[PDB]
């Protein structure tokens, strides 16, 4: 029994490892793409705003 089931248990981990990987990339696809992620360093001119104002 332990020989036959160990094969079932072995296979499972393997499938389990692939299944998490497949599902992981998919899940990851909906995450932010490279284009958006690459957003930073907005430049702001202090002179633009005077006291009592928001921009």
């Amino acid at each position: 029994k332990g020989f036959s089931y160990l094969v079932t248990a072995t296979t499972t981990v393997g499938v389990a490892y692939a299944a998490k990987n497949v599902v992981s990339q998919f899940v990851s696809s909906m995450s932010a793409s490279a284009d958006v992620l690459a957003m930073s360093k907005i430049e702001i001119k202090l002179s633009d705003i005077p006291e009592g104002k928001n921009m």
């Binding site: 909906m30 995450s31 793409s33 958006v36």
Partner: protein
């Protein structure tokens, strides 16, 4: 053909109760509305573009340059409104006549209700107006309430830091794909019901009086379809903007926020509840429970009579429940200021107390009056 058997088994030789009123039409209307939505949605999909630069332009191109494209677009919008009208009356029929004792049918129903609400929300986001963008941010933000994984989930759905093209395109895909899942769930809904047959307004065993469906409840469904089409076309051809918001006819400005943010009217009852609870999380949960309380409904039936035809105290409590559901629909519309808030808080307290507490106690009292308890 073997299929003809299935064709007959569910629509021709199906034994139906002879005394079911016009309310039993409504579910069939929902199915028709689903098809109508799908058909109109398909004819919106041949010209709509899910790009934030071109979504509003594509919608205006549909309304102005496609032959009868305004007709199909406003049929789609007012058919979503008609879908929610028929859905609310279907759920009210199920609550009033004790049809929730068909527990599997009821649970597949509340799953269908959740799917339809998600589909309508993403569809309202789809035209990319001012109101759609601020509405999306708002409800997507609702998710952030989650205690630990909230932020991630929100960002996932948005597909970025804030709703932007990333969202619009995936919302187009999801809004396209969910009504077919709704159709499959409706097939499961019909199956879980034929195993038990429909209920009657008296709530009694109608096995002694059943009639065919082809000549008796088919022409009745055809007449109900004709009346629903009359109301839908007088909503489309005469008052095409009485249910929508004017601010959705402006383009989506992330810099400009509207002075008052609403979802469309059928989300209002929920909106009220959310606003009522002070805690953000509390609101989200209560909101969910608002819909989920229904699923919980078959475990709260403590009466020996299935329907409310012979139960006057629970009839009074039911109409008070419909009354403060209308009150919560009104409050959602009202802005945040006295005394709209207090009503909202009470109305939510009264809603949950009538569904959770008052109806089983009233059913116990009604059983005591008939010398049954």
């Amino acid at each position: 053909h073997p299929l003809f058997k299935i064709i007959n088994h569910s629509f021709i030789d199906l034994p139906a109760p002879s005394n079911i009123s016009s309310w039993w039409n409504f579910g069939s209307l929902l199915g028709v509305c689903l098809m109508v939505q799908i058909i109109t949605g398909l004819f919106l999909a041949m010209h709509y573009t899910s790009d934030t630069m071109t979504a509003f332009s594509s919608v205006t191109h549909i309304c102005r340059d496609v032959n009868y494209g305004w007709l199909i677009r406003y049929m789609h919008a007012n058919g979503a409104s008609m879908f929610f009208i028929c859905l609310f009356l279907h759920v009210g029929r199920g609550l009033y006549y004790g049809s929730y004792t068909f527990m599997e049918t009821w649970n597949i129903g509340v799953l269908l209700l959740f799917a339809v609400m998600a589909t309508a929300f993403m569809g309202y986001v789809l035209p990319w107006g001012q109101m759609s963008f601020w509405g999306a941010t708002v409800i997507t933000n609702l998710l952030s309430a989650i205690p630990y994984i909230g932020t991630t989930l929100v960002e996932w759905i948005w597909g970025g830091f804030s709703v932007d093209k990333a969202t619009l395109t995936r919302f187009f895909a999801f809004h396209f794909i969910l009504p077919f899942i709704i159709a499959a769930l409706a097939i499961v809904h019909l199956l879980f019901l034929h195993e038990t047959g429909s209920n009657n307004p008296t709530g009694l065993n109608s096995d002694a009086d059943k009639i065919p469906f082809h000549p008796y409840y088919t022409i009745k469904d055809i007449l109900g379809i004709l009346i629903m089409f009359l109301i839908l076309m007088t909503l489309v051809l005469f008052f095409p903007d009485m249910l929508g918001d004017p601010d959705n006819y402006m383009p989506a400005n992330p810099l400009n926020t509207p002075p008052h943010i609403k979802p469309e009217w059928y989300f209002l009852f929920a909106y009220a509840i959310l606003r009522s609870i002070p805690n953000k999380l509390g609101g989200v949960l209560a909101l969910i429970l608002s819909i989920l309380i229904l699923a919980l409904m078959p475990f709260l039936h403590t009466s020996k009579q299935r329907s409310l035809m012979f139960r006057p105290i629970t009839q009074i409590l039911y109409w008070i429940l419909v009354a403060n559901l209308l009150i919560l629909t009104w409050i959602g519309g009202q802005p945040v200021e006295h005394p709209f808030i207090i009503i909202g808080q009470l109305a939510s307290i009264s809603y949950f107390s009538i569904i959770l507490i008052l109806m089983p106690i009233s059913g116990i009292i009604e059983d005591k009056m008939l010398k049954l308890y």
